[PDB]
Amino acid sequence: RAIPELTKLLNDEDQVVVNKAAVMVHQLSKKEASRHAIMRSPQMVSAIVRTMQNTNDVETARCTAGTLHNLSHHREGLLAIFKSGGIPALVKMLGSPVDSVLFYAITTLHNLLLHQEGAKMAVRLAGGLQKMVALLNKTNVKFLAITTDCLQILAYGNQESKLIILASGGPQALVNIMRTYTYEKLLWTTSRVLKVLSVCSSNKPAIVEAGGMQALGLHLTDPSQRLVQNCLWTLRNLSDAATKQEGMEGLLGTLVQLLGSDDINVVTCAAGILSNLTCNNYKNKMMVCQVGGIEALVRTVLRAGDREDITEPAICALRHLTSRHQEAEMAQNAVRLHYGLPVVVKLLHPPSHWPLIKATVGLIRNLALCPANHAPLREQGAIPRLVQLLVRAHQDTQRFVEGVRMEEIVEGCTGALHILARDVHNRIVIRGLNTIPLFVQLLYSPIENIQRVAAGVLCELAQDKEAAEAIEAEGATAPLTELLHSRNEGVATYAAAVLFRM
């Protein structure tokens, strides 16, 4: 019965009379008995929402905000707070300089977001993200925990809400949370917000330049698995955009160590990050190589077996580390001394898919650059399998599988053979698989790289008299004559050589 009265009183002009009622009203909502009475009365909820909104008293706000907070623990409560436009008003309390009001506000908003349909869209219209992000400078970690979780529910599956967070300086703020705080629950909710934004094609660099890479890597060995995993997935999504950032040295040592974790998923993520973090970046290549990188990546392939989800990123990483940097030879070389060859060469066999076979053809290409690798690669049965894949690849291009064009395969294999043919023993085998007729036909490719390695393989081979007549007798002379004139010095250099030895 009191409800209809206070409702009246809250709509009074004498503000003194109003705050008086919000106090009482807020004392009635403590007991579920009187609480229901309130939820059940639209004039009571509106009343309150309108008072908290319009009020200018630092306690009428407290009590009004306090009241609808205690109303949001139940289903019928949330609807009443929603149907009376209470969200725009709660977003308005997010600017209060009074913590209580603030606290009561982010909690009620969190509740509506979690259970009230229409809440998410309402908070965005009311400009909730911008305000929420402004509140990331607060020093109360629990407040930050609920605030950050709000951003995660609003941003999830919403690029717009994502672009607004980003445009409000959000990234650099969450990233600073990861540098300063040790409260696991905060770190978690934040990490989850960074995770959702790292898939966005605008947020990534914002997160990378603010130092997100180094700050997600700070908690890689914290005890919390959920924290670790989230930090890893986020680091993986950011990795293709982090290839040129300095200071990755420590995150590199940690990632290596994690390959030896007990969680395949952790190992999988880590092999992913090392794979991307090693692309075209010499500083990173050497760091991986310095802290046990090769042996660890190699051990990862072995441990993984058929799991392409692991072998692939890991094999790509070995590929990156074995080229274009001062110690590429030291790497190429180290993969043998750590017993990698057996499992590498084995990966070209079934049931390996093309994505992996391609990447593995590249590692092999690179590993053959090292003379001490020729005999080993041969004795593991590389030439025969490299030779039949090329054949399957060549025939397709005459007969874009799995995202892998067969011409790239045609080039790599023939590329690896061009290199392996630097040994006399290897040469015998290559000839022995009647390949000369196939490389010759490879002279007629519209692609230069292909002509180069075909010419290239044929130059090595032709230094053997008989094999030289084999090529000549194959019709090589004609096409080579044209290749003689290419602008691609490589193709012309090798063009001119076969003819000479021929």
């Binding site: 909690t107 407040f143 990795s239 090693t278 790509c316 274009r324």
Partner: peptide, 24 residues
């Protein structure tokens, strides 16, 4: 240029007790 190629990853994906002690 751009030798080594990248792999693209886009894995997008208990506060009740936190909230009660934040108000009380």
């Amino acid at each position: 240029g751009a030798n080594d190629e990248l792999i693209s990853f886009k894995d997008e994906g208990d506060l009740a007790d936190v909230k009660s002690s934040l108000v009380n």
